[PDB]
Symmetry: D2
Subunit: 467 residues, 4 copies
């Protein structure tokens, strides 16, 4: 009922023209946005609503059955052209929002779709100029959240000196929020999976994020960060927190983020002997991009040791998880697109089935298709006591639509906190400093393969049984 404003900062960027404008399209088309919602794209280059429409519609997946809606949404939008570090431009933007139907009373939601190098200014000029004194103000901030503990600490200190945690929404583009809630209901609403979610029963946890494509085109941007900062420090660590957290006092966002930050506090810094770093190389037998390696892109500087694959073993050192490995295995240009949580359970204490039993597994897959199944063992039909392994299933805006919708709803559970991000960077900072100090060479692996075999050796070493 309350009027809302959606201010897309840096609306001329690729992220705005390809992923955010289509997302608010899909939210308004499905009737999920509040009825009184305005979309104010603000950027430097001078554009109009017609220009935004022309440059963004290809990604709208538009259909002729709903072109009428394609007008209404675009009658709800507006554009402001101004520099990111000019107070007059932000004054014009604030006046423009005020020059709307109940714009002063509206709840303002700033989606920062602009390079992080100018977050410091953009988050600053917002506070004095474009804030709302009646409705709430919320900023959505995109990664990179710095690159070290120090850089992230200074950026977070700036944003927290200006805004509060109730106004900061650090977004994770790879968080399903549907398999996350599936995890929470599975392990917290059920006594089947309650007592077994600890050291005594779980042997290892595997947290996977594989991509079948390399770093085509935008390989230079990936070079300065690496796969640990790109996927592992932020996403896989949040998945680890969700897997390993204790039951919160309630389903409140703060009560869940407290458990997650506690899990992060129980994790120590990463040692280089628990890390396998790999880099993908061209595949002579490939067809398309598979024949070109990471260093074959003309945008990647020569002799770059940036890892496109990482397998890292972590240990949550508390009463529930002491000694249980957490293998974060992420990679680009791998064989498949996969993102899942895998728990092997220990072998049953005392085998009366003649070593025919395999470790039970609980798999919560998020990509490509969501699923929740258990690999247990059932009696093989026949005349005999010989068990056989069976996979038993235990289980629609996509992940990104439901994440922008959380910022509207104020559900800040699935966004990383400031102390949470601080612990996340504390865990990985010494290892990253060592990596870009000594400059070790990552293991080369073929495009489309499963990654370096040293990763498999490391998982086997830490206690992972593969059939």
């Amino acid at each position: 009922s309350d009027t809302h404003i959606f201010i897309i900062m840096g609306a001329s960027g690729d992220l705005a023209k390809k992923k955010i404008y289509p997302t608010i399209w899909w939210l308004f088309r499905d009737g999920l946005l509040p009825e009184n919602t305005f979309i104010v794209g603000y950027a430097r280059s001078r554009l109009t609503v017609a220009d935004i429409r022309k440059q963004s519609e290809p990604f709208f997946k538009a259909t002729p059955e709903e072109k009428l809606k394609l007008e209404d949404f675009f009658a709800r939008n507006s554009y402001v052209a101004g520099q990111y570090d000019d107070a007059a431009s932000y004054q014009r933007l604030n006046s423009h929002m005020n020059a709307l139907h109940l714009g002063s009373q509206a709840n303002r939601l700033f989606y920062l779709a602009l390079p992080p190098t100018v977050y410091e200014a953009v988050t600053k000029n917002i506070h004095e100029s474009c804030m709302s004194q009646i409705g709430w103000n919320r900023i959505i901030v995109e990664k990179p959240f710095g690159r070290d503990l120090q850089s992230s600490d200074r950026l977070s200190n700036h944003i927290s000196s200006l805004f509060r945690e109730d106004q900061i929404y650090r977004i994770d583009h790879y968080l399903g929020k549907e398999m996350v809630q599936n995890l929470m209901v599975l392990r917290f609403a059920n006594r089947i999976f309650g007592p077994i979610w600890n050291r005594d029963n779980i042997a290892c946890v595997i947290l996977t994020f594989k991509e079948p494509f390399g770093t085509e085109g935008r390989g230079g941007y990936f070079d300065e960060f690496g796969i640990i900062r790109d996927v592992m420090q932020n996403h896989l660590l949040q998945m680890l927190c969700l897997v390993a957290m204790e039951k919160p006092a309630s389903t409140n966002s703060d009560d869940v983020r407290d458990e997650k930050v506690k899990v992060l506090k129980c994790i120590s810094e990463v040692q280089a002997n628990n890390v396998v770093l790999g880099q993908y190389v061209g595949n002579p037998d490939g067809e398309g991009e598979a024949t070109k390696g990471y260093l074959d892109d003309p945008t990647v500087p020569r002799g770059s040791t940036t890892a496109t694959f990482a397998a890292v073993v972590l240990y949550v050192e508390n009463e529930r998880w002491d000694g249980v490995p957490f293998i974060l295995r992420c990679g680009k240009a791998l064989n498949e697109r996969k993102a899942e949580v895998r728990l092997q359970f220990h072998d049953v204490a005392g085998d009366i089935f003649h070593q025919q039993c395999k470790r039970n597994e609980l798999v919560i897959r998020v990509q490509p298709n969501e699923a929740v199944y258990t690999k247990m063992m059932t009696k093989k039909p026949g005349m005999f006591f010989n068990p056989e392994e069976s996979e038993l299933d235990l289980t629609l805006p996509d992940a990104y639509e439901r994440l922008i919708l959380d910022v509207f709803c104020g559900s800040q559970m699935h966004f990383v906190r400031s102390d949470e991000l601080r612990e996340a960077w504390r865990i990985f900072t010494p290892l990253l400093h060592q990596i870009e100090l000594e400059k070790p060479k990552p293991i080369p692996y073929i495009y489309g393969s499963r990654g370096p075999t040293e990763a498999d050796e490391l998982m086997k070493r830490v206690g992972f049984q593969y059939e």
Copy 2:
């Protein structure tokens, strides 16, 4: 390869002509019997193989495709007419077995299909004359195994003075052998269901045996025994033992039967305040037998307080099952045919879902439609943390064919032992003595109903949460 002889004692009885002869039919037709297996019916009335064939074919459920095979089976059988308590008849029977291809070397398997009041004689004669000096000798003993602890004790003492436990096969017609193996593999090969199979997680165990029909025709025979001796003292108690047993040292029959008797040794005698007894009356509404009550059967003595339904709460007083109710609910002329094991689990400690979660259940239904499924809370598809109860499935000669096969293969695991039967009668003897001494009146319940509501009240009292 070894030659076998199958001696059907009392082959003229209804049990042999309707259940045993068709079963050896289906075992030979399916190629499951050993190739050199002879069938020797033995009874009082002068009959021939042709007479047995005439009395047996309607229940054989044969087809024209295998009628030639029929001849083979009926070229394989033989008949002996002799009194059950005459040594000359048993000498003739032993000579007749000796007058077969390798009859002296054959393994002899006696199925005692004759009234229990004659057992004490027949077994004696079997030991005197018809035993085999080369191959093994095995007797299949049919229930009733006495009426109480004293009668069962004397019968078992006689049979054990003659034969050993390796030769005694006390058969349970209602035991699946298929879903029992599912139980054992599920709870002993899987770590998912291992740690949760105890006091801490399981709230109650419900062992059910319902029949939708009454005691038509043969109601007088049921009158002298009652539903406790009919279904509960023998079958449901074995199901209880299988559910509650510790993991055996191996899958050997003796190692499993030791756990069964150990479970029985820690069940106290049944108290009448944990027992609800009912008797079915006619559903006037109508149907067929539904309109005839238990006492409306002319063969049932007038003023009979025999219970056709019983709900009994037991407690396995040991480290794993202290305080966990075991509700044996058995009944005739109930609403449905059902035989299942139901484990409710405790409510999750700490409910963050606003009392929306329901107790998890593990259901192992043996008949009809064998199934193994868990009712647990899954995330309701949508937008919020809403748990909803969902039923997730975790899962061929019939039970009787696979039980006669056990005596051939020597798998004695699914047959009750002498000490196991002694404990089974020890548990129920005081209650049965009280019932047939005081003669309480069972609660009348409508034919086709769910039984007396006092059973539901008793389960609610002992800790059964019904939704």
Copy 3:
């Protein structure tokens, strides 16, 4: 070194002249204070160091051997006479503080020994004038912390608007700091008491605080608060938190206080059916104060329903403590002085000792005669398997000296936090408002007795097995 100042706000009060001045005297005498420490009393009435000495020496409990040291102590003291709500007086106090050896560089430690109704002013003035720009500033705040959730929230919001949690030290005079550390090392450094510290094994927790004396003289001050605010809302609740808290991420003060507030968050509001309130009356027989009841004290208003005894059952509704009662039993004019934690464990699952076993107990007695002992079953010497109950022991400035030392050392673990106090008041606020709205009459109990019998009945009802 790092010169310190100890500012006793309200040094003319009874608390300063009887408990605070002797405590800092014993801390300086024992060589526990930092060498460069000044004690600056500040009050309204015009006094001097000689007057403070005259009013303080009888409570100093000094000896002629160390009298010279006493002189040294009084060489480090000074006095300032100024009103509590006068900015000029605080300017003079700050100037006097600066007029010391490195007074500007000194770490200032304010002990607020003045009535709570003045706190709102004093803290303000302390923030305006008497802050230190170089060293740290710490305030020690005495109870009462308000009368309910609203008053405590007001005072806490004021103090937190001025000071931060690193500067607020809310003192608990009844907390040992000695047996708390024994409790933490017992349940966190030992695997003997780790796994058993939960629902599965612990039947109930009893937290006791008894005083053998009544409310002599100062009965009017106790009238406006009651035993729930006096001892139960603040002290016994912190003992509950220490008993029930999860293992912290470290021994840091914040990591422990986080677990304590997490335990508080999962305790529901108190219901009047879980509360037994009592008032002590004259033990006629008596001898001294025992002959005078609570209402016989002339300063107590007539017809006062203030409870001098309370037995309250709480439930920590989380995974570790769901369903386990926590009986806080506190009282004045009871039979003995006692303050202990008592855990009964559950009965052993499966009794092979013919019901001769009693529930195991773990007792952590804080005063008098600090002890840790388990009551378990040991084999009675002789020829037989008959266990007998045996008490086995598992186990220096007093508590108050070690608490003032914490504020110097910065160990803020044993002081209540703002959110901790908020949850503590949230638990008890509805019950207290109901008590002072309906005005129920507490059960009268004899001076020197064990309390009302309804408390024993309530413990027996909730699951306390007293042998």
Copy 4:
């Protein structure tokens, strides 16, 4: 009443004159034997009561105060001189037994104190002639119980063909029966030690039997057997069974020996890579026997590889003990005399005390100075969270007197069964056969030392944390 006869078979042997006659002395003197108990020595050499008295009194340890009672005892005894394999002598012994006050009605208790090579004869004759038709008959059998599985099976089959298990009492001279009851009451009457008694908490179990002396003169008798048959196959294995057994259905002897044999059934055969064997050699620095080695004894055959020390790691492959080492360390000529059960517990999951905690231990020392104590971490008195290890104590005819009393009382709990002995020999037979086939050389260790260092290395390898 129920007059008793105590038949010492082989009363002229050293075991009778040094251990048995003094034991029945101490049993009769203490008023522990039944009043009408007769002692009948039976041997080959022609002796009288006076000769037995002369060879017995020096070991009786008598005092002048009770010398009168002495004649009573020697007025109670009798002697029969007859060959061990002569039916006429046994008929004479039976007639002499009948030639006593109510000798025919007496309960006969035969203590076989004669070389094992004669057992097969003696028992036979005992069954033919000397049995009692009215009272019970009980034979006490002494180790060796064969040399391996085959010999023990032969002897046990013979004795079980003659006697039943209710009549066989296989004696263990090293079993306390006082600290065994302490074990059972400790771990079965207490919830403190119940849940923690498993894989999740116990790291290793150490069962020790050290002797400070070596084979003095009877090294020839020890040579044919070795320390595995002498102390480990029989005594330490029973200690293992008592430590590892599940809770019996009752304190009945059969219910306890069932759990013991069930524990034995889930122990695999011993592998030579889990065995360290040692032989003691003379110590130049010794004074008495310490300077003579095992091979320095003229009775020991030259080049004897008999192990006087053994450290063997076993694994009870069941639900409660899978993967938990059971280190049986036994030895002769070691540093001290000791026999204890030691349980180390696992390190606490999550150390908040900076690697200062040591593994908790539960020690049940049987000799010398019987004790039960736990080593756990207690808070070191002071100002600090640093724990220190502390030893907390949790705790009369000698063991042999209480064992002969058990045979009188019919308590067969602490004697090894036929199937128990069969499993015990099954575990150790392959290893002993390998030892006698390959003839490995044991590690030489100094007399009075702690044993070979390879034993310490083996324990460290299997998971024993020594501080």
